[PDB]
Design a protein around this ligand. Structure first.
Ligand SMILES: *Cc1cc2c(cc1C)nc1c(=O)[nH]c(=O)nc-1n2C[C@H](O)[C@H](O)[C@H](O)COP(=O)(O)OP(=O)(O)OC[C@H]1O[C@@H](n2cnc3c(N)ncnc32)[C@H](O)[C@@H]1O
Ligand SMILES: *Cc1cc2c(cc1C)nc1c(=O)[nH]c(=O)nc-1n2C[C@H](O)[C@H](O)[C@H](O)COP(=O)(O)OP(=O)(O)OC[C@H]1O[C@@H](n2cnc3c(N)ncnc32)[C@H](O)[C@@H]1O
Lengths: 356, 356
């Protein structure tokens, strides 16, 4: 049995390690990732006065994986042919390959559609880019005063076909990861309050939809009140379309003053999945599955983490959760009786609570 | 300066200790509590198969407090005369004392109106009663099968006058602490799943209102889906009125099968506060204040924790938060320049997230 695991982070690693440990020699587990190293830093930075806390974990998949009986091949998946059970990918040297699998675990995540934002290259500051959050840190300390805009781009969620899961297990969201926006808004207020710059800096938070949509209307009104108190502006239904040097523009031509734009880029499906077997993926580019992480169309394709349709919001711990489930369900198939954990939706992001 | 602190838990102790440490000799801090000891166990028990984890902290206020420069007097507050700044209370010997204060910090919490539930004495199992968690534990392990009902009683929230705080800082809730109901429902399912009794035991969850009201409809629907999957029934708008041996009845005379009734009693204002200066308290028996914890009517009365009107849901950490604020604001008044922390509403109970 050859099991291919696509990707190298939460979903992939969880599934690979859990699978190998569970079946050992009963299967060959191989991981294909677009890069040799996988980095795991902290969700949000620590904007502290004169205190820069570095804490990154760097994994070398080529060494770390074999050490666990898992093979590793670096390459960029270009498409998955679910019909012929082939994974097409480009190697670092530019060459093209395709490997057959008996089972595939898709953990290549989603996509941060920065490309959908005119002026991104020139004036954007992303919260999800590695040493891009360093560019921000430096920018924030040298900031003399002005306007700051913080928010996320729209979530191009797929809707059809639908995951084979109980009712209401998958929410409809205008934003894929919004909680971090609330936290960073509060942190930025703190940082500037400590620098006695509250009068020099003006923070505007923007949402592609209603803002923290897992909350009740009152809880959302409460959050707005907090912003009012802290002198933070809130603009709803602002689907960012462009970044200029001093402002951001929405799809309707409305603007927000912004000398510094902190953006969680729009979420779209992974291009490699958009280019895969049409009926493997939904209109968004995500793989709909059942509660066992098995594709609703191809019984030998598993989708985990961000790449799976049901993971909304797009959370690392849901990635780990789905990674395990996929691995336990598969182990059973490979003749190793294993308990398959039940999947739960999140209900609410705990970051919605300021006391967090 | 004589500062009286009423109560002996989260709000009281936080305020007393914080105040004394902040002003030292600049004031006499004395605590009056209905009992000599204050116990601090765990919010919810640990229903484990043959594994009973005890972990309770027992404080002797008479020794612990003076050790910090805080006097202690045991007695049961009967009423507060805000107009004359007198606190009336019964001593252990049965005598009725009446002391005067320059400032008072009310931390006597709320009330668990078990008395409002017919048959409580005879067949009730409370989640908020010290060793009541014990009577339950023994009952649950001897349970051969049948029906279990779990939920909370209505919250007799006060509405007038209103707290002097920003808009939407205080929610309207039908239940004062509902999160624990969700957690326990999931835990009880686990306990019985491990005993292989899922078919022998039938769990029904009941809510005085629309359950987990801080959540969006879509999050509430998700929760309902989880219940459905787990075989747990949900009955909303069920304001309990009586507990029989094998069913719970609400006001309307409606029933829910219940051989074991796990109830978080209804929340009402502390009777001592209902019998205090009429314009100190709201229609519920809670003390409305501003963001500094100062009564909106008497500038030398502070209300902290459960006894304060704004603490909804009724949370220990909000008690600790309000306790600190009260103490810092007062310290400033007593000539000790101190930073007064900003008060935030909770937004959501993190227990709403099953991954918690
Ligand atoms: C951006 C962000 C995310 C976030 C957060 C705060 C911010 C600013 N806070 C979180 C929190 O508080 N709690 C939590 O649980 N999650 C939080 N998140 C989310 C987390 O980033 C994601 O949910 C998680 O990363 C999802 O993991 P998954 O493993 O599913 O996806 P991924 O991390 O993107 O990994 C993708 C892997 O696949 C490889 N890849 C991608 N494309 C290819 C191709 N074509 N070929 C081969 N490999 C590919 C990537 O290199 C990566 O290894
Ligand atoms: C019941 C419950 C509560 C709870 C929870 C789960 C359950 C089952 N889970 C919680 C959680 O996950 N997180 C959290 O922050 N809180 C949680 N809670 C709430 C917590 O119990 C309350 O919010 C907290 O106890 C409030 O504290 P406070 O100090 O305001 O009130 P109190 O604990 O009732 O203390 C009352 C003190 O006053 C004394 N007292 C009462 N009446 C008198 C009179 N007449 N005279 C003198 N003293 C009086 C009491 O003896 C007590 O010392």
């Amino acid at each position: 049995t050859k099991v291919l695991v696509l990707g190298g982070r939460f979903g992939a690693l969880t599934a690979a390690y859990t699978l190998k440990r569970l079946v050992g020699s009963k299967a060959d587990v191989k991981v294909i990732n677009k890069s040799r190293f996988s980095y795991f830093r902290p969700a949000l930075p620590h904007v502290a006065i004169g205190v820069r806390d570095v804490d990154e974990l760097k994994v070398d998949l080529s060494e770390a994986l074999p050490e666990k009986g898992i093979q590793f091949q670096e390459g960029t998946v270009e498409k998955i042919d679910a019909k012929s059970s082939m994974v097409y990918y480009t190697k670092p040297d530019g060459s093209m390959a395709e490997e057959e699998y008996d089972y595939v675990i898709v953990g290549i995540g989603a996509h941060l559609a920065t490309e959908l934002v005119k002026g991104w290259d020139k004036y954007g500051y992303s919260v999800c880019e590695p040493e891009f959050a360093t560019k921000l840190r430096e920018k924030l300390e040298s900031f003399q005063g002005g306007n700051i805009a913080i928010g996320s781009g729209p979530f191009y969620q797929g809707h059809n076909p639908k995951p084979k899961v109980p009712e209401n297990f998958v929410p409809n969201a205008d934003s894929a990861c919004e909680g971090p926006v609330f936290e960073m808004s509060l942190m930025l207020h703190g940082y500037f309050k400590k620098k006695g710059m509250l009068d020099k800096v003006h923070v505007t938070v923007f949402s592609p939809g209603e803002y923290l949509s897992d909350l009740s209307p009152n809880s959302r009104k409460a959050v707005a009140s907090i912003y009012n108190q802290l002198g933070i502006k809130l603009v709803h239904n602002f689907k960012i379309k462009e970044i200029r040097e001093h402002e951001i523009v929405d799809e309707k031509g409305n603007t927000i003053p912004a000398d510094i734009t902190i953006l969680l880029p729009p979420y779209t499906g992974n291009p490699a999945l958009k280019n895969s077997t049409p009926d493997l993926v939904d209109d968004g580019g995500f793989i709909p599955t059942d509660l066992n992480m098995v594709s609703i169309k191809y019984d030998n394709v598993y989708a985990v983490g961000d790449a799976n349709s049901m993971t909304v919001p797009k959370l690392g711990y849901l990635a780990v959760m789905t990674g395990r489930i996929a691995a336990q369900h598969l182990a059973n198939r490979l003749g190793v009786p294993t308990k398959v954990d039940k999947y739960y939706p999140t209900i609410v992001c705990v970051a919605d609570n300021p006391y967090e």
